[PDB]
Coordinates of C-alpha atoms (C1' of nucleotides) in Angstrom, one line a residue:
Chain A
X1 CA 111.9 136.6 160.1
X2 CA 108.7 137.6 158.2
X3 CA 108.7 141.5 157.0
X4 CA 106.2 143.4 155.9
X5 CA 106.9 143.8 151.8
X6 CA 110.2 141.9 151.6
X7 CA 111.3 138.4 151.5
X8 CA 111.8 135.6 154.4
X9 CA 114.8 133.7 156.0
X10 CA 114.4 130.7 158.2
X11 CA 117.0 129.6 160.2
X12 CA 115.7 125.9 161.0
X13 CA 117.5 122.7 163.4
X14 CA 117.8 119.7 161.1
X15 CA 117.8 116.2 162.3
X16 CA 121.4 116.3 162.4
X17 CA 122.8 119.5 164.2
X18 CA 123.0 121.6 161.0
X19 CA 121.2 125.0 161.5
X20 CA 119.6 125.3 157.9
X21 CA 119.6 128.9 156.4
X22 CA 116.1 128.5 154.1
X23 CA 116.5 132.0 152.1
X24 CA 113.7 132.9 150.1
X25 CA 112.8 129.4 150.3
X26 CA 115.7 127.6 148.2
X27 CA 116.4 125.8 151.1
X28 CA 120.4 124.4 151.9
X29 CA 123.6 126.0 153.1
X30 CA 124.2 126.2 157.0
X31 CA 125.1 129.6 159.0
X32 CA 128.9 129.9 157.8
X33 CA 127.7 130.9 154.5
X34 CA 125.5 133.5 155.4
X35 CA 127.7 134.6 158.4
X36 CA 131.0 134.7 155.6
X37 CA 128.8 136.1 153.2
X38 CA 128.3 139.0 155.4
X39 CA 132.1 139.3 155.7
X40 CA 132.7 137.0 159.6
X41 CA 136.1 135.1 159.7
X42 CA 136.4 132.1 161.6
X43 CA 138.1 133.4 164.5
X44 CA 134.5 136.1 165.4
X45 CA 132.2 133.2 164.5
X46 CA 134.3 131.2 167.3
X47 CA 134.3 133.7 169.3
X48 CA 130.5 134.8 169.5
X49 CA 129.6 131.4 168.9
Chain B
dC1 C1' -1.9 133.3 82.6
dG2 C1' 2.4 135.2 81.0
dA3 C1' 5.8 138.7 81.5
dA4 C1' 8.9 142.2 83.1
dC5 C1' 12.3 142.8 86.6
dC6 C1' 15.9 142.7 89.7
dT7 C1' 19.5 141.0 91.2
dG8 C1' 22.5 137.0 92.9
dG9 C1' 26.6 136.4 90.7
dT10 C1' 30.4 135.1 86.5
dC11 C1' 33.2 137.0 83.7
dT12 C1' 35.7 140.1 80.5
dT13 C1' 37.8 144.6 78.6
dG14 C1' 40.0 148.7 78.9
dA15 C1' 42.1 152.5 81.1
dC16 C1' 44.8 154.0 85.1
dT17 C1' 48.1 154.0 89.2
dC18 C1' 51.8 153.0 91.6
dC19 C1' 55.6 151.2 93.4
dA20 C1' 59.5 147.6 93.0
dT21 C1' 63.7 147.2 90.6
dT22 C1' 67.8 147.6 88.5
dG23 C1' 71.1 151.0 86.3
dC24 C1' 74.3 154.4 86.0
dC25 C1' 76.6 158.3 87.9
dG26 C1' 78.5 161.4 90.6
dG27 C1' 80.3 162.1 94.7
dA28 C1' 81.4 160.7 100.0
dT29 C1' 83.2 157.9 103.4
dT30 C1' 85.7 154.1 104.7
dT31 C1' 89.7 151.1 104.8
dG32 C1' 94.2 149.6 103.8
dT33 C1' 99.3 150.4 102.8
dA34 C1' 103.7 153.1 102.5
dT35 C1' 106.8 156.5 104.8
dT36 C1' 108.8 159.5 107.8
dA37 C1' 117.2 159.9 108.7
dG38 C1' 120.6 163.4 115.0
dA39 C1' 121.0 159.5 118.7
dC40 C1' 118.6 155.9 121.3
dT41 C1' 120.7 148.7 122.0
dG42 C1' 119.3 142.8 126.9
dG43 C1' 111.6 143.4 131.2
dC44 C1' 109.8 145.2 135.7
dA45 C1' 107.5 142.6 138.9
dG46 C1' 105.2 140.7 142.8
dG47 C1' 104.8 137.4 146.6
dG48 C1' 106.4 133.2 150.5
dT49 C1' 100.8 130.9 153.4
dT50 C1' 96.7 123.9 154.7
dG51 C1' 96.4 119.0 155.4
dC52 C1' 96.8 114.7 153.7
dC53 C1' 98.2 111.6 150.6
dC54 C1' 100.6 109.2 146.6
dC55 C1' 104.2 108.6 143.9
dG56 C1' 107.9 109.8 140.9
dA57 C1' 112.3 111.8 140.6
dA58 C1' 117.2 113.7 142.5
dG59 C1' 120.9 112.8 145.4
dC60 C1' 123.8 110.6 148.9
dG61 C1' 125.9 106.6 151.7
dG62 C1' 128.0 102.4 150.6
dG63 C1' 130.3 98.7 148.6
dC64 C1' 132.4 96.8 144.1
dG65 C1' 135.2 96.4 139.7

DNA sequence: CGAACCTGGTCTTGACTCCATTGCCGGATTTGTATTAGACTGGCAGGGTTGCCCCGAAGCGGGCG
């Protein structure tokens, strides 16, 4: 997700099945922590995904 | 036949000129330092791009005392 005058985010597929959340590039920490971070409980993130 | 001469220099003496060369001296300018009393208290800031390779370091699975 490349802006135009801002920073990037990469959400990558690892060799194993953990979608990889690459943020500025300081790369770890799969899609629960972004998706909490943004305030998601369990029980959305199960239900959209 | 000798003799003046006339003129190359070779050199000196004496007066004159003229400009460096310090030397103060008075002032001009140049450069350095000190001091300003209301109150003020943790940066803006700019980008992230290749490919390939080597190798050294961090961290994690996996057994072991």
């Amino acid at each position: 997700v490349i802006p135009s005058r801002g920073a990037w985010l990469e959400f990558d597929v690892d060799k194993r099945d953990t979608v990889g959340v690459r943020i500025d590039r300081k790369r770890r920490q799969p899609v629960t922590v972004l998706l909490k971070a943004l305030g998601w409980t369990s029980e959305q993130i199960v239900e959209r995904f």
